[PDB]
Amino acid sequence: KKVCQGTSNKLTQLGTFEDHFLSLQRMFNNCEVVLGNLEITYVQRNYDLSFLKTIQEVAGYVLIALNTVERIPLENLQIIRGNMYYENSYALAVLSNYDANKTGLKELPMRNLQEILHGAVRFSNNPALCNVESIQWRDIVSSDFLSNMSMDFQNHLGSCQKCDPSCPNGSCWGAGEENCQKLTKIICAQQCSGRCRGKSPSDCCHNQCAAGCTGPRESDCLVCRKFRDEATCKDTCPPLMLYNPTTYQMDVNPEGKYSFGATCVKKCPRNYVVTDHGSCVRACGADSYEMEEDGVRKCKKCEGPCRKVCNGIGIGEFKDSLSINATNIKHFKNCTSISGDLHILPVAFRGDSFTHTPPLDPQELDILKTVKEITGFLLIQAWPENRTDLHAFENLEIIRGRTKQHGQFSLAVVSLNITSLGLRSLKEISDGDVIISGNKNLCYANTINWKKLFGTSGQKTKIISNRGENSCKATGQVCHALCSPEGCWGPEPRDCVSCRNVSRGRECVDKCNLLEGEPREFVENSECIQCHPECLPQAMNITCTGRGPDNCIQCAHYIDGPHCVKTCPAGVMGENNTLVWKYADAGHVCHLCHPNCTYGCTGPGLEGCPT
Amino acid sequence: VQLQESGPGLVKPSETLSLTCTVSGGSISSSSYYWGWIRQPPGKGLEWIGSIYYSGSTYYNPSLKSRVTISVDTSKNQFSLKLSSVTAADTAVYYCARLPMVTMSFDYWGQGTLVTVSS
Amino acid sequence: SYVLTQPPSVSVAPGKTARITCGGNNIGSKSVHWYQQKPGQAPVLVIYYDSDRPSGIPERFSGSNSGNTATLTISRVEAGDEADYYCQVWDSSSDHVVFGGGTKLTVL
Ligand SMILES: *[C@@H]1O[C@H](CO)[C@@H](O[C@@H]2O[C@H](CO)[C@@H](O[C@@H]3O[C@H](CO[C@H]4O[C@H](CO)[C@@H](O)[C@H](O)[C@@H]4O[C@@H]4O[C@H](CO)[C@@H](O)[C@H](O)[C@H]4NC(C)=O)[C@@H](O)[C@H](O[C@H]4O[C@H](CO)[C@@H](O)[C@H](O)[C@@H]4O[C@@H]4O[C@H](CO)[C@@H](O)[C@H](O)[C@H]4NC(C)=O)[C@@H]3O)[C@H](O)[C@H]2NC(C)=O)[C@H](O)[C@H]1NC(C)=O
Ligand SMILES: *[C@@H]1O[C@H](CO)[C@@H](O)[C@H](O)[C@H]1NC(C)=O
Ligand SMILES: *[C@@H]1O[C@H](CO)[C@@H](O)[C@H](O)[C@H]1NC(C)=O
Ligand SMILES: *[C@@H]1O[C@H](CO)[C@@H](O)[C@H](O)[C@H]1NC(C)=O
Ligand SMILES: *[C@@H]1O[C@H](CO)[C@@H](O)[C@H](O)[C@H]1NC(C)=O
Ligand SMILES: *[C@@H]1O[C@H](CO)[C@@H](O)[C@H](O)[C@H]1NC(C)=O
Ligand SMILES: *[C@@H]1O[C@H](CO)[C@@H](O)[C@H](O)[C@H]1NC(C)=O
Ligand SMILES: *[C@@H]1O[C@H](CO)[C@@H](O)[C@H](O)[C@H]1NC(C)=O
Ligand SMILES: [Zn+2]
Ligand SMILES: [Zn+2]
Ligand SMILES: [Zn+2]
Ligand SMILES: [Zn+2]
Ligand SMILES: [Zn+2]
Ligand SMILES: [Zn+2]
Ligand SMILES: [Zn+2]
Ligand SMILES: [Zn+2]
Ligand SMILES: [Zn+2]
Ligand SMILES: [Zn+2]
Ligand SMILES: [Zn+2]
Ligand SMILES: [Zn+2]
Ligand SMILES: [Zn+2]
Ligand SMILES: [Zn+2]
Ligand SMILES: [Zn+2]
Ligand SMILES: [Zn+2]
Ligand SMILES: [Zn+2]
Ligand SMILES: [Zn+2]
Ligand SMILES: [Zn+2]
Ligand SMILES: [Zn+2]
């Protein structure tokens, strides 16, 4: 079906009345399913709204306000799911559809609106509006939202045509014979669950239907209450992950399909991405990024802060800016990649009268702590008082150095009172030189092996006039015993450029937990990685050889094929929508139950499933 | 030959002293250097007057705050110095030198010009 | 502001080592820069950052800064080294820069 998103402007008019009509016409032309909200506002008289007769489903709310057009042909609108609310709990608001002439919305022929899932409706200040007073809303709106209805019908001075005599209790949406209200809920018998087709229990609708049904089966609903897979209304789309007994592991279900609004699709439509919860979304929102898998786009959560490039000193708005001050530091919030330079000069903390800039607050320096990339250089000749290291740059890893200071240096840290550099994550300096001089309390500076960070042939380093190494070594300000001979950025083992043996996370350690330690580990690339929580720690041996439960030496609880699992699969969904149940024998090994044992077993055969 | 000084060598007392420093061989609109004025009376020592960045931010000498106004214009590629209410003690050779930010020392010095105040 | 103290005159034998001092209230925490000004010429940066040497300065020029006195040490003094020497420091917080009184170095 043809699908459109919808609008959310509420009561805001887009330019002139014609401009507002054009944007509304572009959105809902040939639209059958509205993913968002349906907002019909500021539609003047004699405007052709014939394109609204194709709308059948709306997920959010329906807003019809400030319209002077007499007929809004929402003829084929069947369901208002109410996934969003207009004001507080309104899934349908028809408010103030008149003008100074007091001749506004007169004909609202929603003859197929048979159910509203969530939310109430509101009608207020709609003169000359006919027939809507006769509608029995108890048959269409949910029974729990009837407590917040707001119906105001004061139209006794307008010329209205009477309902058709064949309408039940005189309830009609419009004047025509087709406009009689189609009751399909309150007239149902007590035995019909949900809705029905007439008045007998032999023509009830399946509880998965929404508006109505042509037959008793599930494939007979007009629209689905929750999801629609192919031609069948289902409570949930087919599971994407199923436990096949062949591989003893959760694998991708070929019949598994994603969720797109109220439909279940094998693939998301064009220009749509799948999320981590199995749904089709227009674009991966905040706190998540986009990545390709199997040639299909998929959303993934951001590794920490998301990528947000920002212009630095000398680019755009920050050109001719002397230093990062209290005026421009507001533009550096959540920035992780600086596209330019960074000046940290004493004029920020002091301020000047020419640029009309107040002193920079030292606490605001933690704003650019998320910065991980600098395309230009880094000039730091000022730093707050009580900070012993570059705390705001502990998450910087790359300085490109396309632009250089004095035609030479790309990293300038001069005339500071810091103790350590604190650049724990700095791993690459592609181009430019490094100058660190004049910091008479700075140690560790001469230890770093800078040829490891360089990337251009000919890069030099100038690190002098700091704290003497004889004074640093006497006070203990030396690299940790666990650091490699390639230097360090501080005393703690978290500051090593590299570890002399192995590492656990970002901290250097003497050895991995192979035979000792509470969390047993294994070694690869000189780094310690935890074993699976199901590999039982061995005394005379290592605990695991890899990551997953396939590489355990001895399972800690139960065994499911080559895997160590906490419990055997009891109640896991399988193929053909048939649950898979297993049991544990004497050796704590998982084996399948009997095919006829639908609710689990404790032993082989039908013995474990008594009557 | 990079930094060139210019201005009237004769100045009467109590009037404004005007001097201009013209930069050549590069661009004064650089983020790597300050621009400073340094003077020394005949037979005395150097005295820093003030520093100017090409954006307009200034730093002055505490002994010459109220009488010194240093500006810079990027189009003409130059920065000037103005000293109001001049006295007999301001007779000096006025140098303009380049002041990088990586060292905060005066890299390149101009040859300076001598302005003498008299009746 | 900050004050720098230099000896007015220092003499040295040809080929020997000359040591020009620069006094300052805890000048060891700051970076000192030395300039050489021959008569009639502009000052020339001979040493920056306490001890470093710009390109174009002979190795004979060495510097040291500790406590409250910085020292400009000329290794093998020649006849052409007779000039005025000024030590210079840049205040970090104040952003001001102060020069010394000068030192007329004379070769015996
Ligand atoms: C603190 O951090 C701050 C943020 O980075 C930073 O503020 C920014 O400072 C720079 C440098 O001073 C400044 O850039 C200048 O902008 C001039 C005009 O910009 C106006 O108008 C534009 C129009 O879009 C606005 O976008 C600007 O924001 C600004 O309007 C101000 O905006 C604020 C916003 O809140 C309003 O509240 C203000 O009311 C409004 N006005 C004021 C006064 O603030 C622009 O003309 C400048 O370019 C000229 O100078 C350049 C050198 O600096 C030359 O290269 C260039 O050629 C331009 O012409 C030159 O002008 C010179 C004037 O001295 C002459 O000497 C030259 O002869 C002449 N050359 C030629 C060929 O003709 C320049 O781009 C930003 O506007 C400013 N931003 C803000 C928001 O304040 C502080 O500097 C930082 N302080 C410190 C100490 O680092
Ligand atoms: C809807 O779009 C079609 C083209 O796909 C266009 O021909 C038609 O004019 C549009 N309908 C309306 C009512 O604007
Ligand atoms: C009706 O409105 C009240 C306002 O307090 C709200 O608390 C309540 O949840 C609403 N009831 C329904 C069914 O939406
Ligand atoms: C009138 O409403 C009642 C429920 O109140 C319904 O059962 C009946 O079918 C309606 N009348 C007609 C003629 O349909
Ligand atoms: C910064 O990121 C946080 C975390 O995602 C977010 O809550 C906040 O709105 C962002 N702030 C700005 C100014 O974008
Ligand atoms: C660093 O410490 C020294 C000695 O106390 C002091 O003179 C200087 O002002 C300090 N630097 C800053 C930026 O405060
Ligand atoms: C280094 O790490 C390995 C792996 O944990 C360990 O076997 C060894 O004892 C550690 N120490 C040395 C000195 O090799
Ligand atoms: C450790 O475990 C393996 C598992 O096959 C076993 O064969 C071996 O004897 C044990 N010891 C060593 C040193 O590998
Ligand atoms: Zn138009
Ligand atoms: Zn509900
Ligand atoms: Zn597996
Ligand atoms: Zn998600
Ligand atoms: Zn999720
Ligand atoms: Zn999710
Ligand atoms: Zn801005
Ligand atoms: Zn700004
Ligand atoms: Zn910090
Ligand atoms: Zn820190
Ligand atoms: Zn250990
Ligand atoms: Zn496996
Ligand atoms: Zn256990
Ligand atoms: Zn246990
Ligand atoms: Zn089995
Ligand atoms: Zn000042
Ligand atoms: Zn100009
Ligand atoms: Zn230079
Ligand atoms: Zn230089
Ligand atoms: Zn001062």
Author numbering:
A (entry chain A): 4 to 614
B (entry chain H): 2 to 120
C (entry chain D): 2 to 109
What does the paper say about this structure?
Epidermal growth factor receptor (EGFR) is one of the major targets of cancer treatment, because increases in the expression and activation levels of EGFR are frequently found in several metastatic cancers. EGFR is composed of three segments: the extracellular domain (ECD), the single membrane-spanning region, and the cytoplasmic tyrosine kinase domain. Epidermal growth factor (EGF) binding to the ECD induces dimerization of EGFR, which leads to activation of the cytoplasmic tyrosine kinase domain and subsequent stimulation of cell growth and differentiation. 059–152 is one of the fully human anti-EGFR antibodies isolated from a human single-chain variable fragment (scFv) phage display library.
Furthermore, we successfully determined the crystal structure of the 059–152 Fv in complex with human EGFR-ECD, which revealed a novel manner of interaction between anti-EGFR antibody and EGFR and provided the structural basis for EGFR inhibition by 059–152 antibody. The asymmetric unit contained one 059-152-Fv•EGFR-ECD complex, and the structure was refined up to 2.9 Å. Examination of the crystal structure of the 059-152-Fv•EGFR-ECD complex revealed that 059-152-Fv binds exclusively to domain III of the EGFR in a different manner from those of the previously determined structures of antibody•EGFR-ECD complexes. The binding site of 059-152-Fv on EGFR domain III largely overlaps with that of EGF, which is consistent with previous information that 059–152 IgG competes with EGF for binding to the EGFR. The domain arrangement of EGFR-ECD is similar to the previously reported monomeric tethered conformation, which is characterized by intermolecular interaction between the dimerization interface of domain II and the protruding β-sheet-like loop in domain IV. Note that the electron densities of native intradomain disulfide bonds were clearly observed between Cys22VH and Cys97VH, and between Cys23VL and Cys88VL, providing evidence that the cell-free system can synthesize antibody fragments containing natively paired disulfide bonds. All complementarity-determining regions (CDRs) of 059-152-Fv are involved in specific interactions with domain III of EGFR-ECD. Basically, shape-complementary hydrophobic interactions between the Fv and domain III are supported by many specific intermolecular hydrogen bonds. The epitope of 059-152-Fv broadly covers the EGF binding surface on domain III, including residues that formed critical hydrogen bonds with EGF (Asp355EGFR, Gln384EGFR, H409EGFR, and Lys465EGFR). We assume that, as is the case with cetuximab, 059–152 antibody binding to domain III sterically blocks the access of ligands to the ligand-binding region on domain III of EGFR, so that 059–152 antibody prevents ligand-induced dimerization.
